[PDB]
Design a protein around this ligand. Structure first.
Ligand code: ADP
Ligand code: A5H
Ligand code: MG
Ligand code: MG
Length: 265
């Protein structure tokens, strides 16, 4: 149906491991969107065709204001092209580099939008598994949007494919290759909330080998400026035992959240 010919391409919006994402406008409708480009050879060399298919299937059928839309796809013997909703205010990653740390109101508001988004996902037993600042985008009114569903699945699950880069956001059960469920996204939520307030993730470390050690041991400390209510929430989500991690409904009505977030559930 669609092809390269139907689009005028604009400036680069970002780069990922496989993905190279561009601003683009559809010629007849003048519709502005984002074009995620993937090189078939690398997709094959790494054998992650199944991830791409998972990404397209899951993201196209989801509908939530805090989840990034995927409108379709096409391909052309060297490349695959994913047609995405354009997020005009960029990544949460960029915003963190800009401001160094977020205040409590900003942090709590992001956490609420996230927990709403994940709640919707878990109600279809979809687990995202790759929640981090580069994969969180911002809409025109500054609202948070989860994106990049390459690693997502239905639960329960084992990990069949190789973890490529950073360990910083993954729970103990996932790095250790065990099986896992919805609770992995709740660990990641804890990691984010820490990083939003402090400027760095709680198990950050100079080598792969050491980060692995700090995560399986749950070794983290707070700077003095982190308030008691934030400490309470984070300590509850970063539980070694998945079953001890709270439910999203509890996160959404935690006192520190309700006091500080400017958005409802
Ligand atoms: N819809 C979008 N709007 C704006 N920027 C985007 C969009 N999608 C991706 N980007 C930028 O491109 C980067 C990589 O996109 P992503 O889909 O996460 O690729 P990968 O799967 O390779 O990580 C993101 O971190 C972001 O900076
Ligand atoms: Cl190539 C292309 C062109 C348009 C759209 C679209 C998605 S939502 C929407 N509301 C009006 C048009 N439109 C998607 C892809
Ligand atoms: Mg990504
Ligand atoms: Mg990906």
């Amino acid at each position: 149906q669609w092809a390269l010919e139907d689009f005028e391409i604009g400036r680069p919006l970002g780069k990922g491991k496989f993905g190279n994402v561009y601003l683009a406008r559809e010629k007849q409708s003048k519709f502005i969107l984002a074009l995620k480009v993937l090189f078939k050879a690398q997709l094959e060399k790494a054998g992650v065709e199944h991830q791409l298919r998972r990404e397209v299937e899951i993201q196209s059928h989801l509908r939530h204001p805090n989840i990034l839309r995927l409108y379709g796809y096409f391909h052309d013997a060297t490349r695959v092209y994913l047609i995405l909703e354009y997020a005009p205010l960029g990544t949460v990653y960029r915003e963190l580099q800009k401001l160094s740390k977020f205040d409590e109101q900003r942090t709590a508001t992001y956490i609420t939008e996230l927990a709403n988004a994940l709640s919707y996902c878990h109600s279809k037993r979809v687990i995202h598994r790759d929640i981090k600042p580069e994969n969180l985008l911002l809409g025109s009114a500054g609202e948070l949007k989860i994106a990049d569903f390459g690693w997502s699945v239905h639960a329960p699950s084992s990990r069949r494919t190789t973890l490529a880069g950073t360990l910083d956001y993954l729970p103990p059960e996932m790095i250790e290759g065990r099986m896992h469920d919805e609770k992995v996204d709740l660990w990641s939520l804890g990691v984010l909330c820490y990083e939003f307030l402090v400027g760095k993730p709680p198990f950050e470390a100079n080598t792969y080998q050491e980060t692995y050690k700090r995560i399986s041991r749950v070794e983290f400390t707070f700077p003095d400026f982190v308030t008691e209510g934030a400490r309470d929430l984070i300590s509850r989500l970063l539980k070694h035992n998945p079953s001890q991690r709270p439910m999203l409904r509890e996160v959404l009505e935690h006192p520190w959240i309700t006091a500080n977030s400017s958005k409802p559930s």
